[PDB]
Design a protein around this ligand. Structure first.
Ligand SMILES: Cc1cc2nc3c(=O)[nH]c(=O)nc-3n(C[C@H](O)[C@H](O)[C@H](O)COP(=O)(O)OP(=O)(O)OC[C@H]3O[C@@H](n4cnc5c(N)ncnc54)[C@H](O)[C@@H]3O)c2cc1C
Ligand SMILES: Cc1cc2nc3c(=O)[nH]c(=O)nc-3n(C[C@H](O)[C@H](O)[C@H](O)COP(=O)(O)OP(=O)(O)OC[C@H]3O[C@@H](n4cnc5c(N)ncnc54)[C@H](O)[C@@H]3O)c2cc1C
Ligand SMILES: Nc1cccc2nsnc12
Ligand SMILES: Nc1cccc2nsnc12
Ligand SMILES: [Ca+2]
Ligand SMILES: [Ca+2]
Lengths: 588, 588
């Protein structure tokens, strides 16, 4: 197995140095390369269990078993002497720059995963190009470098969430003694958007600067893979050209879906438009029930908006449905209206958006409930959050041979490789993976290390924790209760649960027995924690640390013998004792 | 070893039933006892690895090997038949109530640990009495049932912390778009104290109700242990009497120390007085540098007070000193003044406290710096936070034989047993243990299970996580960096660290590169995480979950292969890569 790994490492690395820590000639090579600003991977064989066997198999490539050994793009360059020879003769730059391709790596997509991968690859000497282009939304919205999370996802989403949370902080401030009349305080949408967009701009810029500092080429151009190693780029000026790369990383992400009803594209918006909307949405209808729909509905309501969510069937399909209902119940009790069991039929325009005064238009939404009653109501803004989809036909020529699944996502091995061996896919377009920013980052960085630094560490996609930033946040790690029962049988599942009340909520006169947490455990596996679920403030901060313990195979006993930090919400996980089987009430 | 455990279990349990799940006569006994409202412990032998050997050793007590077997206070009562005989003959109440002592358990101290222990003991049929008395502070401050945390510690402390945090929420609200002028908002101390004291009152009451519902006798009387089994109680009316108990739990906690300088007792206050103070402290001097001192100084400043902390030498002695300095630096940059290397010499009174208008007095504090310069400044309130101490001479007659250490704390075995075999100590008075509310609760509950339900689980006092609720919170679990280097040598310690910025702080224009986290790891033990440290918002929520993973022996690799939740502060722990050895800057 070692021989197989070395052959792949040598073929793939752009510039790699085989060396040892306790080695003088190696350090001489290292310091030379550093002075010439030649980045490279390094593998200290003395720090590997199979080092000596690798040092021996190396001779199959270099005809020698000594260190240091320096390779460039699959070719042995030389020992200490031959490198200094190339250096003193000022032939070294041309040697390390010699390639069949323009780049060692072309990243198509400048998002969470693509930027992470490209940055990490350049760290090890890979000549890297990052392509990013943002196809405007139907109304013309566009944005800068960074992807969905940075521009029209997590970042603006959580900042607007924060602005909504401050609403309740303003309410709580009175009970804690602050001379404040919440009822005389209003929110200015455009002031918030200005600050949100200023921060996004600082990220767009920080990314450009980061790529320049790491000698990464950034091209604001639409990329199209026409052969395994050839990418066709169209720039702002419609100019077409071709660049070649050894490895290709597809990281193009997804975009929001629209329902196929009249008026939807013309008069509605999506999350892509919401976070830079130059006017307050006003009375808003959110169509959909995903975490995007509920998060957006949630903070609009907390900002004082008249918000309605049109729900076709259930909330947060794919999430623990007990928790989903508690999420929705909280929102419905805190200003969010729900048109349940209802779908839209058409969007009719009543007022055009006022560009000059920054005011929304006005729309008539027609729909129908399952009970046959008609839905007809006026809204100033209609937001569709009915899923997202890849658009790889715009990126992949069918002739290249990259296998897509029925949903249009890329079918990959557990090392992100597509059916074209030099082409990989990371992030949301990777079929079957959790569609989250830290997953894409870890996938891209770990892939870059395997390609160009000889690493073997794969990304672990199991038990990836999540948090839905609804008005009351919901964090989760592992299986939902229903999936655990499905997988192992009701008799083999024990569920410990408890309501709780944040100490912060007491003086503030907020609700008993609404915040809630549960551990879904497997009786036959020493009460292994299969899933953790918490509804309450700062649920992301609560949940994160437990994800490490679950990764390690935490049991209920592991939670119990850990001591709580008091007063916190998270400590309740260390004293859970009421089981669902017992029928005892979880209230406190 | 089994025989030893059974002998202790039988001797100690008040009412215990040996049984099996798949047993008909057992359920008959259970249902009888339930109807008669006789609480008891139960041990299903079919759910123990050593069950059959226990069922056999049982005959050494009962002369039989069958189930069910019912014991009362060390005496076999009978099988199914003999119980129903006692029941039908209405002799069963007198049997289970038969004892040499008035109580199976007398808890001296109605605090975190004592109430937890007493409640859990009654759950298994132990006739329990909880004694609580609150010796007034020098100025006459007193409070109700619950202990230090409930009345004059964590609970009011964190609520006032929350009131201080709301100050910055009010500041942040503007940048997030809220039509709010922070500069025109003031804080009303007495309104906050009213709400804080209302919540404490609901806890005082909830505890009384809980003890009544569990048939626990609550005595508001000063307890004094005069012999192993005899407690002398003095009530409000100075009436003296004696009650006897089989097991005794000492849970009397500590009280604040005063420095031996003129004016300190007469004119200063402590935390015991702060949280019900009927007047705003005004310009305040906090003398001390513990987490109490900094927490109290912190929230007073955030409420707009003119606050000074007089620090003799370093901050937070016993905590990681890198983190302590970052804590202090943040406070000094956010309105807290520090009189460094300074001690007090005397407190002179300039104004008496105004009882009628609720206004503080006025004090002249005289002291001196290490450089010889005199300290002389006027303060309206002077708070001493210079440590806490037990007062067991007021509780333990020297003749009983309970060994105390030099500091006056009880020297205990790892099962909380004192040098008097029926007397145990939990909580802050237990020498050498972390002085925290969840430790006392876990100790008391687990002890109660060992005494009266045959449990063997001990409390694990290692790697207990902490959080200091200073204006910028500091959570920690495990070793400080300096202690790890002391214990294993600098060469065997790797420290990964990073600054970070909460997303919430970006639009709010708060500080880059102030929040900070580090993992202190042991190179030779697979990079085992010896200590985790985080300075930032919600640090208690962040830290808790990682305490489980550290309990399980988390390595750095365990943190790395876990995926982050984005956007959170806690996710930064899953991507740490800068080491201290590397000299690379931790900034972002
Ligand atoms: C409202 C919303 C909120 C979200 N909140 C969270 C959250 O809180 N936490 C979390 O973990 N995840 C969240 N997500 C998901 C997160 O944004 C994605 O998982 C993440 O962006 C995926 O990164 P990626 O690299 O796979 O794709 P992307 O980030 O979308 O990057 C793809 C980039 O490639 C561009 N591109 C497309 N085609 C081409 C082409 N031919 N040539 C060049 N460039 C091209 C795209 O325009 C884009 O710029 C949210 C998503 C949405 C819509
Ligand atoms: C300002 C302050 C803030 C704190 N914040 C935190 C925090 O955030 N998180 C945390 O985990 N810990 C915190 N602590 C520590 C926490 O309060 C203690 O660890 C906890 O109270 C210990 O519980 P205990 O049972 O050992 O003692 P206690 O809670 O103090 O209970 C002892 C009870 O017994 C009474 N008593 C004494 N003598 C007698 C007698 N002869 N007869 C009858 N009754 C008697 C006492 O008056 C008292 O009511 C804080 C402490 C202080 C002073
Ligand atoms: N529990 C709930 C609240 C609001 C809308 C819903 N659709 S399904 N379940 C719901
Ligand atoms: N870093 C610090 C800030 C304020 C007071 C201090 N005493 S010691 N170190 C300190
Ligand atoms: Ca616990
Ligand atoms: Ca990670």
């Amino acid at each position: 197995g070692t021989s197989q790994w070395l052959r792949k490492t040598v073929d793939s690395a752009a510039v790699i140095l085989f060396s040892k820590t306790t080695c003088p000639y190696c350090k001489k090579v290292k310091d030379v390369l550093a002075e010439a600003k030649i980045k490279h991977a390094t593998i200290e064989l003395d720090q590997l269990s199979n080092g000596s066997a690798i040092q021996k198999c190396l001779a199959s490539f270099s005809k020698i078993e000594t260190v240091p050994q320096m390779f460039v793009r699959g070719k042995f360059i030389g020992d200490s002497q031959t490198v200094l020879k190339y250096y003193s003769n000022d032939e070294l730059a041309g040697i390390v720059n010699e390639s069949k391709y323009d780049y060692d790596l072309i990243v198509i997509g400048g998002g969470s995963g693509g930027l992470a991968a490209g940055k990490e690859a350049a760290k090890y000497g890979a000549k890297t190009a990052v392509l990013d282009y943002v196809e405007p939304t139907p109304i013309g919205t566009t944005w800068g470098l960074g992807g969905t999370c940075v521009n029209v996802g997590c970042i603006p989403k959580k900042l607007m969430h924060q602005a909504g949370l401050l609403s309740h902080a303003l309410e709580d401030a009175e009970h804690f003694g602050w001379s404040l009349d919440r009822s005389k305080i209003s929110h200015n949408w455009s002031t918030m958007v200005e600050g949100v967009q200023s921060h996004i701009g600082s990220l767009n810029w920080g990314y450009k600067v980061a790529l320049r500092d790491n000698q990464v080429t950034y091209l604001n151009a639409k990329g199209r893979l026409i052969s395994p190693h050839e990418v066709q780029i169209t720039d702002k000026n419609q100019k077409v050209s071709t660049i070649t790369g050894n490895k290709i990383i597809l990281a193009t992400g997804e975009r929001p879906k629209y329902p196929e009803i009249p008026g939807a594209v013309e008069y509605g918006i999506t999350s892509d438009d919401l976070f830079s909307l130059p006017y307050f949405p006003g009375k808003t209808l959110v169509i959909g029930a995903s975490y995007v729909a509920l998060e957006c509905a949630g903070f609009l309501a907390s900002l004082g908006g008249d918000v309605t969510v049109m729900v076709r069937s259930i909330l947060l399909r794919g999430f623990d449905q007990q928790m989903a209902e508690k999420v929705g119940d909280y929102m419905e009790n805190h200003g969010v209206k729900f048109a349940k069991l209802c779908v839209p039929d058409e969007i009719k325009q009543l007022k055009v958006v006022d560009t000059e005064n920054n005011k929304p238009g006005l729309l008539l939404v027609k729909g129908h409930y399952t009970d046959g009653k008609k839905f007809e109501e006026e809204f100033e803004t209609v937001i569709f959050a009915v899923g997202r989809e890849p658009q790889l036909s715009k990126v992949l020529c069918e002739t290249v041979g990259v296998k897509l699944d029925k949903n249009g996502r890329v079918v990959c091995t557990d090392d992100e490789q597509t059916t074209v061996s030099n082409v990989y896919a990371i992030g949301d377009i990777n079929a079957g993976k959790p569609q989250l920013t830290p997953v894409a980052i870890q996938a891209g960085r770990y892939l870059a290390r395997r390609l160009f630094a000889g690493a073997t560490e794969l990304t672990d996609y199991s038990n990836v924790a999540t948090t839905v930033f609804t008005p009351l946040e919901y964090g989760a790690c592992g299986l939902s209760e229903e999936d655990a029962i499905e997988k192992y049988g009701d008799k083999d599942i024990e569920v410990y649960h408890s309501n709780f009340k944040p100490l912060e909520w007491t003086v503030a006169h907020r609700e008993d027995n609404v915040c809630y947490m549960k551990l879904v455990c497997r009786k036959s596996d020493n009460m292994r924690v299969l899933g953790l679920h918490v509804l309450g403030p700062n649920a992301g901060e609560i949940t994160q640390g437990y994800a490490v313990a679950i990764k390690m195979g935490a049991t209920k006993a592991d939670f119990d013998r850990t001591i709580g930090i008091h007063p916190t919400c998270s400590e309740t996980f260390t004293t859970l004792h009421v089981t669902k089987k017992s029928g005892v009430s979880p209230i406190v």
